[PDB]
């Protein structure tokens, strides 16, 4: 049972008896979208911080693991102990993190972290394709809007940090009216609510930055082309829903509809996908996989795709978007069965694996912007209602002759230009 | 198929360029951009730099054959005038 209570900060704990661990943390209902393009990249440095090594080794001294995640909409910082010493957690997280920074914003340690953090994003620039052509897509997508800022920030801005705009950042975001205080694992929500109760554990006064601009979707695309590398990378996108939005389930399993791709798996050549029907015999793509990825503001619809066959890109793409085309006007009832018990088996461990952390981030994300956690059994009525009639509604909304996002890497001489690539959004037969 | 020969040209995925790599390209919607957006300041602006620059290429080139085909013409009248048949017989 997930239960939440408003004293003091939102105190949100979901009790699970069988585990063997517990997880205390904070979220914050800050993310890469809150900072600007000369700041850009505070936040992951401020996780850096939390996760240097003087930190980690004084909780790993009691027993203790960190955990730190940066994304669009919030930060995540999650101390996960064993059971009896789920009080020392936040113990530690007053102490450290809350209480005092002078320490940890000290001049060489500073100076570490920021010469640390350059180095893992510039290899992260050159060495890591699928990741950083889905950051540009995202870039690219949102321009000029705060959620196209990448969590990781640029190379040249990160430069010119320094530890006042760490704190500047800190005084304006980490505040008791954005933070949620979240309880996983073997812990009891009235425990928790008493040990908070025993310390104060006030983190500032409120009143957080708001946003003069709303994120908004443009129908754009950005071309970095390179000769020396031996595939193309190429990730494309229209505008999905937001979270809270009525059509999010049918968005998801619309995306299970299609579903994801391995070449060299010899069982997921004989998935139900028809999609396969036209990539197989030529060997189209090396693997491919489809997302609904949804934010506070707005959302991206998609796939994502690899392939080694440079001359035959074109043909990769025309396939994947007729079989999207097909949503609007035929899609067949078995299709729809199918997807119901595949997606619930995808939420399903989702949300019920062993290990808290996720359940943690999950949690803390959530009664951020519902104020409340949908429960796993009424997630399923829903997906079960699901009919022909709402994912036709749906796709005749969100993709029928849209516009779209593209971003690729690579030898991507093969692919063509953006209005070919629009025009395969609508049949034309119908 | 038979062989072929060598061109100085490839295809979608081997066009025969030299290899490229740090150069980046933007594109926007047509969707979502206003054309005709500057055809004025175009017209105007654009069009006087573009003769000014390329107009004595073609001017001097057609200043020569005009006079040269005047000076004939307005002789050939006189050589075929009542006044200059005299100089006619001379050249007949
Ligand atoms: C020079 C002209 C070059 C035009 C090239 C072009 O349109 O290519 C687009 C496109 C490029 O091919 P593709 O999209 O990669 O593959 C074919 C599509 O799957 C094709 O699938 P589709 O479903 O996207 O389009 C099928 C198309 C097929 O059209 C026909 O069969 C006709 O159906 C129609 O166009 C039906 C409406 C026809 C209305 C005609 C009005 C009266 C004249 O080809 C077509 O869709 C063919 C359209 C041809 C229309 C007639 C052209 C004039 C004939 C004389
Ligand atoms: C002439 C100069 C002038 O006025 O503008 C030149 C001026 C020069 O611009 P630029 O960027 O320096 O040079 C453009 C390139 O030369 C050419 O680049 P482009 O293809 O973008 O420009 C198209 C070009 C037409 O280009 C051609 O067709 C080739 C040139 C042929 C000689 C000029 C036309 C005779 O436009 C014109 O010159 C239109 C002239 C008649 C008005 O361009 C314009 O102003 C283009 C727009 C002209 C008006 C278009 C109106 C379209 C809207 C009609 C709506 C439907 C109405 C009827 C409903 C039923
Ligand atoms: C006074 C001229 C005003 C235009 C101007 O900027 O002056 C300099 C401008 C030269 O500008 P540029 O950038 O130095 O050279 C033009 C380039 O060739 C680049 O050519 P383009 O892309 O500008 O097109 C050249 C021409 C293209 O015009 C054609 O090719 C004529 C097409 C006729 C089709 C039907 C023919 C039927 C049979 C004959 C009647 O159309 C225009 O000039 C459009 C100007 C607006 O003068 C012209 O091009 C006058 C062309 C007049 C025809």
Redesign the pocket.
């Known amino acids: 049972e997930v239960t939440q209570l408003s004293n003091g900060i939102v105190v949100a704990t979901e009790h699970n008896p069988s585990a063997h661990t517990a997880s205390v943390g904070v979220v914050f209902g800050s993310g890469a979208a809150n900072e600007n393009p000369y700041n850009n990249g505070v936040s992951n440095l401020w996780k850096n911080i939390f996760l240097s090594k003087e930190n980690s080794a004084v909780a790993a001294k009691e027993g203790l693991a960190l955990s730190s995640n940066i994304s669009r909409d919030f930060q995540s910082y999650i101390v996960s102990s064993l059971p009896g010493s789920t009080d020392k957690s936040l113990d530690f997280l007053n102490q450290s993190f809350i209480q005092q920074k002078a320490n940890l914003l000290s001049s060489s340690n500073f100076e570490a972290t920021k010469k640390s953090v350059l180095k893992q994003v510039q290899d992260f620039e050159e060495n890591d394709h699928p990741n950083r052509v889905l950051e540009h897509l995202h870039s690219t997508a949102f321009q000029n809007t705060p959620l196209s800022l990448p969590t990781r920030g640029t190379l040249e801005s990160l430069e010119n940090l320094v530890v006042a705009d760490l704190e500047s950042f800190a005084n304006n975001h980490f505040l008791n009216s954005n933070a949620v205080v979240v309880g996983t694992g073997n812990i009891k929500h009235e425990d928790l609510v008493n040990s908070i109760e025993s310390k104060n554990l006030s983190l500032q006064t409120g009143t957080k930055p708001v946003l003069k601009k709303k994120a908004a979707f443009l129908g754009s695309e950005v071309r970095l082309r390179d000769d020396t590398l031996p595939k193309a990378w190429i990730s494309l996108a229209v505008e999905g829903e937001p979270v809270n939005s009525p059509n999010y389930f049918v968005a998801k399993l619309a995306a299970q509809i299609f579903g994801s791709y391995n070449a060299f798996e010899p069982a997921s050549r004989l998935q139900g996908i028809k999609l396969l029907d036209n990539i197989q015999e030529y060997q189209l793509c090396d693997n491919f996989n489809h997302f609904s990825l949804s934010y506070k503001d707005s959302g991206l619809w998609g796939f994502s795709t690899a392939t080694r066959n440079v001359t035959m890109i074109?043909?990769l793409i025309?396939f994947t978007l007729?079989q999207w085309?097909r949503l609007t006007i035929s899609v067949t009832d078995t299709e729809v069965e199918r997807a119901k018990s595949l997606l619930k088996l995808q939420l399903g461990q989702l949300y019920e694996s062993g290990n808290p952390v996720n359940d943690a981030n999950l949690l803390g994300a959530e009664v951020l912007i519902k104020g409340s956690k949908l429960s796993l059994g009424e997630a399923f009525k829903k997906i079960d209602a699901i009919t022909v009639k709402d994912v036709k509604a749906w796709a005749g909304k969100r993709l029928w002759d849209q516009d779209i996002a593209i971003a690729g890497t690579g030898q991507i001489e093969g692919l063509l230009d953006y209005m070919?690539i629009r025009?395969?959004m609508?049949?034309?037969?119908? | 198929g038979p062989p072929s020969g060598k061109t100085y040209m490839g295809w979608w995925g081997h066009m025969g360029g030299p290899k490229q790599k740090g150069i980046t390209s933007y594109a926007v919607s047509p969707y979502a951009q206003k054309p005709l957006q500057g055809i004025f300041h175009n017209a105007v602006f654009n069009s006087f730099r573009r003769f000014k620059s390329q107009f004595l290429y073609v001017l001097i080139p057609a200043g020569i054959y005009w006079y040269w085909w005047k000076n004939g013409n307005e002789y050939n009248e006189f050589l075929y005038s009542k006044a200059g048949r005299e100089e006619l017989e001379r050249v007949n």
């Open positions: 074109d043909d025309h007729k085309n070919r025009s395969d609508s049949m034309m037969r119908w």
